[PDB]
Amino acid sequence: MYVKLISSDGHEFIVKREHALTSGTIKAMLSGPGQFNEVNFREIPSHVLSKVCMYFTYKVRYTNSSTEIPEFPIAPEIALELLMAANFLDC
Amino acid sequence: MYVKLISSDGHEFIVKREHALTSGTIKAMLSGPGQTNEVNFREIPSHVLSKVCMYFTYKVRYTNSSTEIPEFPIAPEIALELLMAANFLDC
Amino acid sequence: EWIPETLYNTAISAVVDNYIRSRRDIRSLPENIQFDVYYKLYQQGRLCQLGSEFCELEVFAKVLRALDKRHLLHHCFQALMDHGVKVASVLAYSFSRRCSYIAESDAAVKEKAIQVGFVLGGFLSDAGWYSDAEKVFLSCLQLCTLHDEMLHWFRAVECCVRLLHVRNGNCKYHLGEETFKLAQTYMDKLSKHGQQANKAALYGELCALLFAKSHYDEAYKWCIEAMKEITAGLPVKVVVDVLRQASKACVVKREFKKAEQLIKHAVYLARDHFGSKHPKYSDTLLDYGFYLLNVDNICQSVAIYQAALDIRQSVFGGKNIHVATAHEDLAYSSYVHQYSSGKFDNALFHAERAIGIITHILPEDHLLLASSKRVKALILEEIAIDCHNKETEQRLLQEAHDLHLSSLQLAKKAFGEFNVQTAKHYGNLGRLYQSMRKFKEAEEMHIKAIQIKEQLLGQEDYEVALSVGHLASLYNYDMNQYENAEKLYLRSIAIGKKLFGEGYSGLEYDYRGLIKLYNSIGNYEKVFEYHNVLSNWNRLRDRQYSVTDALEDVSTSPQSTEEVVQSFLIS
Amino acid sequence: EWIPETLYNTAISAVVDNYIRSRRDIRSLPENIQFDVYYKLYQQGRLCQLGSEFCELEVFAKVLRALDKRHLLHHCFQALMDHGVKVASVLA
Amino acid sequence: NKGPAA
Amino acid sequence: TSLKPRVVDFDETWNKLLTTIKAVVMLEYVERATWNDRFSDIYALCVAYPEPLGERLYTETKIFLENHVRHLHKRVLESEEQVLVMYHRYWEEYSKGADYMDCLYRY
Amino acid sequence: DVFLMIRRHKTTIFTDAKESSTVFELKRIVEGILKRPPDEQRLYKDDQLLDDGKTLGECGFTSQTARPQAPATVGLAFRADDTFEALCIEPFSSPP
Amino acid sequence: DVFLMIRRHKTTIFTDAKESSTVFELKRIVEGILKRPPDEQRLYKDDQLLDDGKTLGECGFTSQTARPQAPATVGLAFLCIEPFSSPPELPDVMKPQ
Ligand SMILES: [Zn+2]
């Protein structure tokens, strides 16, 4: 059930399927003939992909939440690179 | 009657005398002990001087031109160095 | 219910707050990423950083390819033009500067410039900056006339159709004729070399230029010529532009049946592809409301202009020429709607905005001021009549008197003495001089307005009938020669019921004129009859006047693209 | 009648069109030129482009030493305040 | 009545 | 090798894309590494420099499927008396494959 | 809830639990991922010894300092050749 | 009028001649600087020798290609044309780094 995400340098970022499916790209990356769990990213490096997995847990449980949601912290240097991978991951 | 012009790379730019009256600095080369008159113009390279004396033919022909004067094309890459000669030569 | 922000939107605000350090590398982002960075700068109000990169042609080239979010680029582009920096002027100059540098270069690099020129020139034409779109189009036209190839004349004709569009809105009608003649040079050359270029959009632009110069006979001739060459394979923007300007020529030709089937389909077709909040849709409503303004559809003519202005206001920011023209029609629509009530409160405010927007962006001698200042002067005329204080009346009439002649002079220079618009101002001055107590000058103005407008339009026209009514209303009160107005008034009712029926707004002041004429000489056998006519007038139009707008009137159209074209052409 | 444009005025039009690719290179030019480059910014209407060149005290000092055209400089410095950029607040 | 059409 | 925009040749990337996309429709086993890579090349083509190869990709996949169904229509047409079993034989290999290709071209 | 970045070499195991949850039962989550015995791995919470028992309440990090916006990390390694390997976690990369 | 430049090794002559001007008479202008006979020198546009009888307009040096902004070029021999220099290249900025 758990989905393993591998970045460009090979560092893997295993994470739950339910939190992953909030991204349209990874929904359309595991689906089709890739159903076989295991996906790989040729372009995405690890440091930005670590932040994306950090965002995956943030989205699911803060959805339709009654309390005030704290802002998502993004590093100023990672901000440009994470934005570039935002549309590609569609999340 | 003929005014020479040497460059950094040794390129020769012998041109007509009255085409050089636009820039007063060239007249300073002819003035003094300079009076073809030998001139040293080492600090300014040949490729940018290929447009400096090029402007002279454009300048003299269009003096009080009845038709509308087309603009003199100055390439963006050579824009920085040519503007150096414009202030130096007062042209 | 506190939906968390998307990581796409969250990362946008993460780089905007660090814009200065990463300013260079933002230009390396993808186009979909790049636009949202800039749109966030406008949303944060950092227009200076937003304007710090739109002044470059290359940066604005990538941004222009966000076709879905073009409606947001227009709202940001207008914000910069109200912010200060003339991003329209520098982009046009920068493009024209780089355009001449590839004249001796290959056609591979050259063809990219025309593609850049059309998207940028089309955008500025959409944004309204016609004075800067012309310099863009003149540069790309120059490239198309350097190397003789079959594709080069295929796009040179595409420049002249849009060159003639940026000169129709800029009131450069004198140079408009030359562009059409220049267009025929490449158009005929392409036709000889086995390529019959489509003369639909190019002939469609004369449906507005000749319409603007009041060449209704020539415009309607070119209305038929433009409508023939339409094709289902044409772009929808091209098709809807033909229908709008073809419908306008029919309204002034005193033909109403074939005009509504054209313009309603133009409204329907524009709303379908583009939407209800697109600039092209609002451009149709102003032309559509022109039909409603002349067919005495006065109740919804104000609403359709009010709807048209709100579309442009939601997309075209603040001080934009298109908003002013939208302000212009709504200002005049309320002028005729509030005529009996006298509630010219928003009428002047729209008119005041119409002066305010144009004077900031157009030169003081531009002809669009003459059209704009005319309606505001008409607002000032009726306001002074309604006001009780005579000291206020004597000042506002002179202020309106200032605007008409300043407007008339601009019309005289660009249109010539013998034109409808110059005679249109003569009719306004005659009514103005009635309020100015210059009755002898009013008589001179009215006879000028009726010996010139009727001379070229003909004995039967809508505006000629009104011009008679202005002088008919004169002899009733100031001159007191009721015999002159007896024949004049009889002409006003005569033309009124040919097309507008009995229940026309101008005929109310015409039937009342006959009773007032008859009341002076003691005639009463017609006063009792014409009192029953007013009772018939008071009911019959109000019998069929119930509230009904025009956006649901058109609704879905059973008529298709071809069902409208052939019906108008054969008839 | 229709005098040809000066080579200095023609070259100043070349750099200003190339401003984005040569913004960082313009700070090394002589003090008698940098004013003209930033003046051509204002003449063309580049109010927002000019704000990034006067909010910096390092480059504004070189412009300040061009006191021959101080009457033109007073107009540009006043233009940005009406434009919206608080160059005086940033300079202080 | 009101005025000429623009 | 990052996802930054870059200039990429279209012929070589399409040819490497053509192998898997020929098997995504008309279902066939495709390697794990291919599916991850064949989604990356779509981003690399739509975000190509200096002009996005999205118009070319859309009109070349369309002409790819133009030569797919037409080549598939010939086989069904020549299979007389068994068109019904043959029509569904490839429709299940295509309708799912169409969603399979829609899955790949999400960006 | 308390969130962790338990990791080993290339692994970046992502998981969540309660504030009063036992540290031991988190090893069952790892058992369901890499299919390893719970005693196979050793938890090096901030390069120091962490007992197999205890609980997440007094482990050394609570819900406030281990939010999903910034969860904390715990070292891990498997016992190879009957010897517990030391922590071998590495940084992801060094972006400019 | 036709404007053009000639380069033998490093020289450059910015002279002007009519569109109907021939080749023989312009060598006298060249003789005034190089002090070389006109028959000895030969000029070469686009790797092609120019005859003395034909004019400047009969060989392709027309007004549009010989503008006073970017004139046409032609070689000279008695080809050893030296390029002027390599301008410092400018980063595209818009190009990703
Ligand atoms: Zn600003």
Side-chain angles (χ1 to χ4, degrees), chain H residues 1 4 8-9 11-13 16 23 27 32 35-36 42 47-49 53 56 59 70 73-74 81 83 87 91 95:
Chain H
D1 209 309
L4 57 92
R8 183 64 214 86
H9 281 47
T11 178
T12 301
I13 301 292
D16 50 318
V23 167
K27 315 200 164 272
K35 296 321 175 312
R36 293 280 271 125
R42 64 180 68 90
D47 272 18
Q48 179 258 0
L49 181 62
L56 287 189
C59 65
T73 187
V74 59
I81 284 181
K95 196 196 69 54

Side-chain angles (χ1 to χ4, degrees), chain C residues 46-49 51-52 80 83-85, chain D residues 47-49 51 80 83-85:
Chain C
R46 293 163 69 159
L47 293 159
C48 295
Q49 300 272 6
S52 86
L80 286 175
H83 169 69
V85 60
Chain D
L47 296 174
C48 287
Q49 304 293 148
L80 313 167
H83 171 55
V85 179

Side-chain angles (χ1 to χ4, degrees), chain C residues 21-83:
Chain C
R21 190 68 135 89
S22 87
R23 186 179 181 276
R24 182 176 178 179
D25 209 2
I26 283 159
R27 287 187 289 269
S28 66
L29 290 170
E31 319 170 325
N32 50 7
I33 301 296
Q34 192 161 205
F35 182 84
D36 271 314
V37 180
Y38 296 149
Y39 190 61
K40 188 70 176 177
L41 295 159
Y42 163 68
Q43 262 171 349
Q44 291 199 356
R46 293 163 69 159
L47 293 159
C48 295
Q49 300 272 6
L50 177 60
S52 86
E53 290 185 354
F54 283 171
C55 284
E56 161 61 43
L57 182 66
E58 283 302 324
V59 179
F60 206 76
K62 269 205 172 86
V63 175
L64 272 169
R65 288 195 288 232
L67 271 298
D68 200 352
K69 291 167 270 192
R70 188 53 75 77
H71 63 282
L72 309 171
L73 190 47
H74 273 104
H75 194 93
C76 293
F77 203 80
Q78 190 43 243
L80 286 175
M81 290 311 271
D82 285 16
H83 169 69

